[PDB]
Amino acid sequence: GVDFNKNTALDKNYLLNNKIPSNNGSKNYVHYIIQLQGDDISYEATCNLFSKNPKNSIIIQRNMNESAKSYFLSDDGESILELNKYRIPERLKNKEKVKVTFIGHGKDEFNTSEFARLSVDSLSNEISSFLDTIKLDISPKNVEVNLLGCNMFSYDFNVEETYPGKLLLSIMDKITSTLPDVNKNSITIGANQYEVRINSEGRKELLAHSGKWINKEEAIMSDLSSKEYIFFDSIDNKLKAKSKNIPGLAS
Ligand SMILES: O=P(O)(O)O[C@H]1[C@H](OP(=O)(O)O)[C@@H](OP(=O)(O)O)[C@H](OP(=O)(O)O)[C@@H](OP(=O)(O)O)[C@H]1OP(=O)(O)O
Questions:
Q1: Which residue numbers delimit the Peptidase C80 domain?
Q2: Looking at the annotation, which residues are catalytic?
């Protein structure tokens, strides 16, 4: 019954008066939060995630297409302001890292072909447009492209056959070409092995084997990895993967 074409427009007062007060450590990054699909679950996740760290984050409802724009918090915290799609305010242009999270649905099962119903080629092409735009504002040293959505990584396949591995090979030269202070060893793709969601406070939870949804701290105690990093190692020119949070787990 999910309507992926609902396309609820961002309510600025919802963020300022409800979500920021409810949900809001200097991160060294600008966080671009890109809502790819028009369902209300994606919309709420985008709002909630932004509202937890509103000063360094940007919302883009990419599902709005020609009407997509950057939304972000004013310097004084009293307003949600706007710029053209993927642009950022002056105060964020000196950050040395970019985190770009694509909010999407994965599938009921692991898959290697699509994220948010987008092929590697399709998402790569959008990332190319994104990179050509953010270079007008920022020249970081580090980039993470974070795929927030279920079942997009498995250690049972070669990293190069997985969607994040394929995506990294597809985009890495565009990243280093456009963002000249980013080298290959400073690009990572974030991906999930398990189902994930953003809770009503803007925190990521993972669906454990028990059927319980668990937060960051509980996942670590449970020895369950909520996010993998996929990266390219120039030393042997191979794609690799490792767990972000679980010291032992790697490709
Ligand atoms: O800084 P990142 O590498 O992008 O990771 C952040 C970071 O987690 P850790 O530094 O503990 O690994 C945030 O923690 P803080 O900076 O706020 O201390 C946490 O947000 P929470 O405070 O809510 O735990 C967030 O998690 P979330 O996805 O819930 O925004 C998580 O990002 P990742 O989940 O993508 O690793």
A1: 23-226
A2: 105, 150
Residues β-bridged to residue 71: 59, 82
Is 141 annotated to bind a ligand? Reply is no
**Ligand 1: distance of its center to the CA of 203 in Å?**
8
Integer Cα distance of 199 and 127 in angstroms: 26
The token duo for 14 is 């919802």
Domain that holds residue 71: 1-251
What residue's CA is closest to ligand 1, atom 19?
A: 203
Q: Method used for this model?
A: X-ray
Question: Which of 209, 219, 208 lies closest to 245 in space, CA to CA?
Answer: 219
Question: How far, rounded to the nearest angstrom, does the alpha carbon of residue 4 sit from its chain's CA centroid?
Answer: 19
Minimum-distance ligand 1 atom for the alpha carbon of 244: 36
According to the annotation, is 52 in a ligand binding site?
yes
Resolution value (Å, 1 decimal):
1.6
Task: Return the CATH number at 238.
Answer: 3.40.50.11050
